[PDB]
Amino acid sequence: STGSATTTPIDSLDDAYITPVQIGTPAQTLNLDFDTGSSDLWVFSSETTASEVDGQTIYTPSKSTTAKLLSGATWSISYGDGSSSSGDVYTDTVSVGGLTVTGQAVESAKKVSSSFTEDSTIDGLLGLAFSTLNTVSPTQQKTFFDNAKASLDSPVFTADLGYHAPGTYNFGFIDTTAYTGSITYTAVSTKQGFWEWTSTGYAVGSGTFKSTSIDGIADTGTTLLYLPATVVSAYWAQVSGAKSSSSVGGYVFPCSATLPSFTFGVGSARIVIPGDYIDFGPISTGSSSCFGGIQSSAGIGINIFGDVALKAAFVVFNGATTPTLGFASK
């Protein structure tokens, strides 16, 4: 089997992407944030504290004839931006772009933190990291991809995120019309539960390529590109007026700037992030100070190839027995 679903930016900055997901019988369609940095499929629901729901579409298990309470199971998760949610668990039928999993753990939110409440466009998350990170207790649950893998034509999914435009998540096949040139595959460590890999270096604009190993994760749930402070400093030094602001919480730059591109290495191959991808707009409405899309990972504890990087590529998440990551230009 295969699945193919369009994923759509939630706002004009590509702060995140939502993908429609069918849950239950009859289908309840929720717009979920496909997150290769986590491993829980959770949703706003009929069980979510009413004051914490503001415009999201909710899953109502009692209206689904295939929903079953997973007795005793609870979940609780926190993300790198400090947001969180928790609740109990159902199993139900979940379909993405024509691909159907029965008995998928659907984690029903009883509580969500303010950032989720305040974001009316995201109805929940669909985790695509490794199932070892799944937070369900006392019986850990599998991700949608893990549950689907054996049924897929090929044990892969691909992320094709758009810049200020829709893109595609495919399951079970590689769309050879969706990228240019060749796909370069690179090794993955699953030891931390992430799609963790090692970039072979970087360049800033038209500058020479610096060969250096950068360990990081391919994380569709993170907006920006988080890299070592040395790298990030080298990038922003090429932007007149750019500075790191502790008050704002990262590098800012004059909105009047034309940003240089940023290249990252995948083996011998190169992915070029156009400068425009690195502009995340005024720090506050009407400001002429703009927030940078490349930020320091110092104090995160890990480098993160977030959407800023991934949307410049066609990315293969290969879930074969020995997982690997593939990147192509597009």
Side-chain angles (χ1 to χ4, degrees), residues 51-62 64-67 69-109 112-126:
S51 60
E52 298 178 351
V53 184
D54 183 4
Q56 296 83 8
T57 293
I58 62 170
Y59 167 63
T60 305
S62 63
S64 173
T65 59
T66 41
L69 183 71
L70 182 64
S71 187
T74 59
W75 62 280
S76 180
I77 189 161
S78 310
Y79 301 97
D81 70 333
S83 71
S84 65
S85 51
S86 65
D88 48 29
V89 189
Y90 293 80
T91 56
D92 209 342
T93 304
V94 172
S95 301
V96 176
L99 170 69
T100 300
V101 168
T102 59
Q104 175 64 45
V106 176
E107 301 170 36
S108 171
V112 303
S113 62
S114 56
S115 293
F116 283 112
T117 298
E118 291 161 0
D119 185 358
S120 68
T121 72
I122 289 175
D123 301 325
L125 267 69
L126 189 147

Side-chain angles (χ1 to χ4, degrees), residues 267-285:
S268 58
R270 307 289 180 252
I271 299 295
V272 179
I273 305 168
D276 288 351
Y277 290 26
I278 296 160
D279 175 16
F280 276 75
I283 61 171
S284 295
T285 306

Side-chain angles (χ1 to χ4, degrees), residues 222-242 244-286:
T222 292
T223 314
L224 309 183
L225 174 54
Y226 294 88
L227 294 173
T230 50
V231 181
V232 175
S233 184
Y235 178 80
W236 288 110
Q238 296 304 309
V239 182
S240 196
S244 181
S245 173
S246 55
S247 59
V248 177
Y251 280 89
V252 296
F253 70 93
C255 291
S256 62
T258 303
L259 297 176
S261 68
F262 184 89
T263 301
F264 65 94
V266 183
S268 58
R270 307 289 180 252
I271 299 295
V272 179
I273 305 168
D276 288 351
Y277 290 26
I278 296 160
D279 175 16
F280 276 75
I283 61 171
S284 295
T285 306

Side-chain angles (χ1 to χ4, degrees), residues 1-62 64-67 69-109 112-141 143-148 150-190 192-242 244-330:
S1 65
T2 61
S4 183
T6 298
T7 192
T8 303
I10 63 165
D11 61 26
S12 65
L13 297 180
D14 300 344
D15 281 313
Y17 299 75
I18 45 171
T19 309
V21 177
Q22 279 72 47
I23 309 175
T25 309
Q28 300 179 37
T29 299
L30 272 65
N31 294 328
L32 304 189
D33 185 350
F34 284 22
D35 180 10
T36 62
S38 68
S39 303
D40 285 49
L41 192 176
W42 75 263
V43 296
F44 279 77
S45 72
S46 58
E47 297 181 330
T48 310
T49 300
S51 60
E52 298 178 351
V53 184
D54 183 4
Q56 296 83 8
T57 293
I58 62 170
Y59 167 63
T60 305
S62 63
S64 173
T65 59
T66 41
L69 183 71
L70 182 64
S71 187
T74 59
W75 62 280
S76 180
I77 189 161
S78 310
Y79 301 97
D81 70 333
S83 71
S84 65
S85 51
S86 65
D88 48 29
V89 189
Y90 293 80
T91 56
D92 209 342
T93 304
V94 172
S95 301
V96 176
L99 170 69
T100 300
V101 168
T102 59
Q104 175 64 45
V106 176
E107 301 170 36
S108 171
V112 303
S113 62
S114 56
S115 293
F116 283 112
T117 298
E118 291 161 0
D119 185 358
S120 68
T121 72
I122 289 175
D123 301 325
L125 267 69
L126 189 147
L128 293 170
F130 295 89
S131 289
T132 52
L133 295 176
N134 174 268
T135 78
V136 176
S137 178
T139 308
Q140 185 171 66
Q141 299 298 300
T143 66
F144 174 82
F145 178 55
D146 260 6
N147 280 322
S151 304
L152 298 177
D153 289 358
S154 187
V156 305
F157 68 90
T158 66
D160 181 9
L161 301 178
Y163 166 68
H164 296 169
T168 306
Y169 280 101
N170 291 331
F171 293 84
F173 72 104
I174 287 157
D175 184 352
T176 59
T177 70
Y179 59 88
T180 63
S182 298
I183 307 177
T184 296
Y185 289 87
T186 194
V188 165
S189 172
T190 67
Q192 293 192 92
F194 300 121
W195 291 92
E196 187 171 1
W197 63 291
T198 303
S199 169
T200 49
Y202 69 99
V204 176
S206 58
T208 60
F209 187 84
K210 175 76 172 183
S211 297
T212 185
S213 297
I214 307 303
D215 297 343
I217 63 164
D219 184 2
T220 57
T222 292
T223 314
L224 309 183
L225 174 54
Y226 294 88
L227 294 173
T230 50
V231 181
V232 175
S233 184
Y235 178 80
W236 288 110
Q238 296 304 309
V239 182
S240 196
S244 181
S245 173
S246 55
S247 59
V248 177
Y251 280 89
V252 296
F253 70 93
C255 291
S256 62
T258 303
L259 297 176
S261 68
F262 184 89
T263 301
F264 65 94
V266 183
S268 58
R270 307 289 180 252
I271 299 295
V272 179
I273 305 168
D276 288 351
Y277 290 26
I278 296 160
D279 175 16
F280 276 75
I283 61 171
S284 295
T285 306
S287 180
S288 70
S289 177
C290 272
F291 199 67
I294 295 177
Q295 296 294 346
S296 181
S297 64
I300 293 178
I302 199 170
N303 301 306
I304 306 173
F305 295 88
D307 298 333
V308 161
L310 302 183
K311 79 174 96 175
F314 177 87
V315 188
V316 180
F317 294 79
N318 170 26
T321 313
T322 296
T324 66
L325 271 176
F327 294 81
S329 294
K330 65 189 183 183

